A = this chain, B = another copy of it.
Amino acid sequence: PLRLGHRGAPLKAKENTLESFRLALEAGLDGVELDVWPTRDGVFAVRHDPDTPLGPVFQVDYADLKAQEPDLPRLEEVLALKEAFPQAVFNVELKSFPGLGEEAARRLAALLRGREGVWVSSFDPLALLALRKAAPGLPLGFLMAEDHSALLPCLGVEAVHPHHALVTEEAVAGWRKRGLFVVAWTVNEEGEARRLLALGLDGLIGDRPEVLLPLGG
C-alpha cells in the first residue's frame, strides 16, 4: 500500500514546508499529502490553517502571506519535488471556504491540467463535482471525517479517504464493491496501521515515516 507523509514529515521539519516534504521523500515514503487554500490572487498556499495574522487566506495575496511567512510554499513548488523523486506521488487536499469551493476547484483543475503523479482529495462534495467537470482526467478522492459513504455513488471519485476510525471490515467491503481506492488517515501508530493494512487498504497517510515504512509485506 502507499505510504504517504502527512504534510510531509511533520516531526522532522515544520508541517507543510518544502523541507518537510523533502525529508518525507528522502525517508523513502511513496509520496506526500499536502493541504492547500487559495489566496486572494488565486495562488494555492500550502498550509493547514485558513486563518493567518493578516486574515483568512482567501482575503490575502500570496506575496503578502509569504512576507509574513517566509517558509510558506505555493503548490507548484511542492509538486516540483517530482523532479528529484520521479516516482513520488502527491495527494493535494483542496480545502474549501465552503461556497468558494467550486471556484477554487475550477482554478486548481486548470493548474493541474495533464499533470501526472497527482490526485486531489477534498471533504467538500461540491468542490469534487466541480473538479471532475473541469478536469475529467484528474484522479480524485473523497475525504470523510464521518461515514458519508452514501454520497460516493454520486461523486466522480476513484478513491475514498476515510478517517481511520471509520475503517471496518464492513465499510471496506462496501468501498471495494464500488471498486474504490481506500486511503486512511491519520495513522501514527503501528497497531492501528497493521489493523488497517490487514483489511487490505491501498494507502495510509501518517505523521511518522518510521511507522509507515515497514508496511507492505
Contact = CB atoms under 8 A, between A and B. Distances in A.
Nearest to A126: B148
Contact of A151 (B96, B98, B99, B129): B129
Contacts of A96: 98
Contact of A150 (B129, B146, B150): B129
A198 interface: no
Contact of A153 (B102, B145, B153): B153
A124 interface: yes
A136 to B, nearest CB: 14
Q: Which bucket holds chain A's interface residue count?
A: 10 to 19
A19 B10 CA distance: 53
A123 B99 contact: yes
Nearest to A130: B146
Total identical chains: 2
Interface in A81-124: 96, 98-99, 102, 123-124
B154 A99 contact: no
Contacts of A102: 146
A125 interface: yes
A129 B148 contact: yes
Interface in A130-187: 130, 145-146, 148, 150-155
A76 to B, nearest CB: 26
Contact of A98 (B98, B146, B154): B98
A124 B98 contact: yes
Contacts of A123: 98-99
Given A125-B125, A125-B126, A126-B125, A99 B150 contact: no
A141 to B, nearest CB: 16
8 contacts: A99-B145, A125-B125, A125-B151, A129-B150, A129-B151, A151-B155, A152-B154, A153-B154
